[model samples]
Target: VNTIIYNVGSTTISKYATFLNDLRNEAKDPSLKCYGIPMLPNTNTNPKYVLVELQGSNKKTITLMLRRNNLYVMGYSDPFETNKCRYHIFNDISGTERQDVETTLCPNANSRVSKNINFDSRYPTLESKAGVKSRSQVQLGIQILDSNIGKISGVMSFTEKTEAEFLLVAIQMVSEAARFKYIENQVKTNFNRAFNPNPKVLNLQETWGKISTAIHDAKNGVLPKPLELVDASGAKWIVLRVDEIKPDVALLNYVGGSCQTT
Candidate 1:
């Protein structure tokens, strides 16, 4: 048997515990063949283990070591044959993190490439405001489901395929379809009012009119933060004005007579 080592980083042990439980539970059922990681003795203080029997003709085992906040995958396999296996790490409550790390285990693997995907700034909303900002961050990783022998080459052709890759690809395909439907529903919800404005869902006489007036006043630099009063015919009229001509002088066009402040 040959060995390959990977310096995978640390994650919460809870996820690993859950996976162990899942394997144990499945093992009880006659129809299901269970796979698991069983704990083994180690000189180190942290948990150490190896994955139980794999599904292939060649019996492969992966050793897991947790040492000083770091996790390592030490896989044992036949040196002549290329064996593929997947190990997961917990990222958040949602699911396991995607594995995009470069590995010497797969020597023929291609390095990750960068690609830009166009996104409209009108999709996601926050606090009743449409998304207007563009995030410049680029994600770097392989397509989660790369070929066992190497990366896909030629006209969408893969030299070798493995069950692990196929499983991930199937999961991703379903996830993508679900997301498309989710976005489709959200798109209809976001644009329903704009699409059919005639049969208005909200009363526009009071709220809409007030908002319109406020916006107009704000645009014209006349929205009153502190009330400005002007005396006209022994009565006060709230001043509506534009840019001040001087520090103490402003021009106004009000319904009543206009005046300058002292």
Candidate 2:
């Protein structure tokens, strides 16, 4: 239930650094933090890629990488290895949405976890000469779901700073929303494990439909429609709110149908 938005080009670090710092100031949300590592160009002793982490609570982190101009987003639960997932990206600015496309997720095996993503067949140009990959800018509405993680969605893109500043704001908003949904399910599971022997459950297929609807709302960066849900025991629950607490954790709430946490 986590998402990542990354850069794919070998652009200068100074520009990216300034853009990110400016974004933090403009968003005015303390939960959204930015930090980076110092690396020199054409150095054998140091790493070649510049890394950045936009961290939220409870492992909700997005890792960004800039190499030569082939930006990519990571942290998406791999759908190829598991058949139980729904991941799609949307173009908020253009009002378009597409399922996960073939692209590089993890560039280096030793740097991050590998997810056997088959980007080789589709993007053969990736191995082409440097600074000549595809798509200089991209906008996406991303959503993912499965039996275990429940539902999650977000907005993200890559640009040459032409639309990056604006696109990042959109990404932040949707990321927070998706993060809320993730925490909601996490809390529910924890509650069930500690308190109940038999837990109420929803049909996996049906849950996907709900996940789709939630992503639609989140794609627009608007408050999602509160979902009315029933557990295996027929207990009713309604989404209360997806609140953001300090240090960037999604605090989602649900109350009973009888209007009681009692």
Candidate 3:
């Protein structure tokens, strides 16, 4: 209601929706938060991914594809041998998932457990006919109940409810890679000040370009979006105001940023 129109009767209200649609449509479409990318110059359709060695097991590695909000686990490598598991007949790794140490490896006196998972062609299917244990374990030997932790391409493309939580600390590694890009950086700092009541006015293109470019290039800067930061190399953070506020004094919420590459 604060945005008042003096001569209200003569005009339609559709033009007022420009910024609304700009922001609204943006919601349905995920933007590349970190700009100067696609990273590839001419390859827009090609997928991008980051591979990293997992922290625990020596040969294990994790590959994740960056997405609009976070990341997705595509493929994983577990390339080692350990007698620690009995992979012959059952799938102890997935079923008794969390309770492995309690059920599979525990002494007979304490307690025991197991699960009924589908048989894999790679493993024995039939229950040895005598006793595959009593209560906690089962091998119904069913055929079609398979488990699939999708392959990289298959997992990433079907975007519904899967994402790996990756804390992205993106630093603006490359400077304003184009002319007038410097103004983008300047506005990042002054934007909150422009929120001040005093000198907050400007002509259409001049000051508009300076400030608008700040957030625009920032959205497309070197990092990525909602993991967004208008900074480079070190760390830059944005403390944002969700609703309404005066620049002189109001609350701004702190959010995410940080990234490194070698």
Candidate number achieving the greatest TM-score relative to the actual structure: 2
**C-alpha positional error of residue 203 in candidate 1 after TM-score superposition, expressed in Å:** 46
lDDT of every model, 2 decimals: 0.23, 0.27, 0.21
Q: Against the true structure, whose lDDT is highest?
A: 2
lDDT of 3 by residue, 1-262 (tens): 0111111112122422232232222221232321221111112222222222222221222221111111111222222223121111123233332242222222243232222223321111222221332211321100100111221112223221111101110000001101122322333343222211111111111222223223333421331223222323324434332111112111111112421211
Please provide, for model 2 over 1-262, each residue's C-alpha lDDT reduced to its tens digit, 9 standing for 90 to 100.
1123333122233433344443222222222111111111221222222333333322333333322111223223222222222222222211110121212333333333332222221122222311233222222121111111111112132222322222232232232223233323332344222221112221211243343334323422332676565444567645423221112222211111211111
On the 0 to 100 scale, the lDDT of residue 34 in model 3 is 18
* Model 3 residue 230 distance off true place after TM-score fit, in angstroms: 17
Q: What TM-score, over all chains together, does every model reach?
A: 0.16, 0.21, 0.18
RMSD of each: 25.0, 19.2, 25.0
lDDT (Cα) of model 2: 0.27
In the range 111-196, model 1's lDDT, one tens digit per residue, is: 32221112211112111121223110111111221222122111123221232232222221121111122212222343212121
Model 1: how far residue 161 lies from native, Å: 18
Ranking by TM-score: 2, 3, 1
Candidate 1's C-alpha runs over 4 A off are 1-47, 52-71, 75-146, 149-262
- lDDT for 88 in candidate 3 is 16
Query: Residue 223 lDDT in model 3?
Result: 18
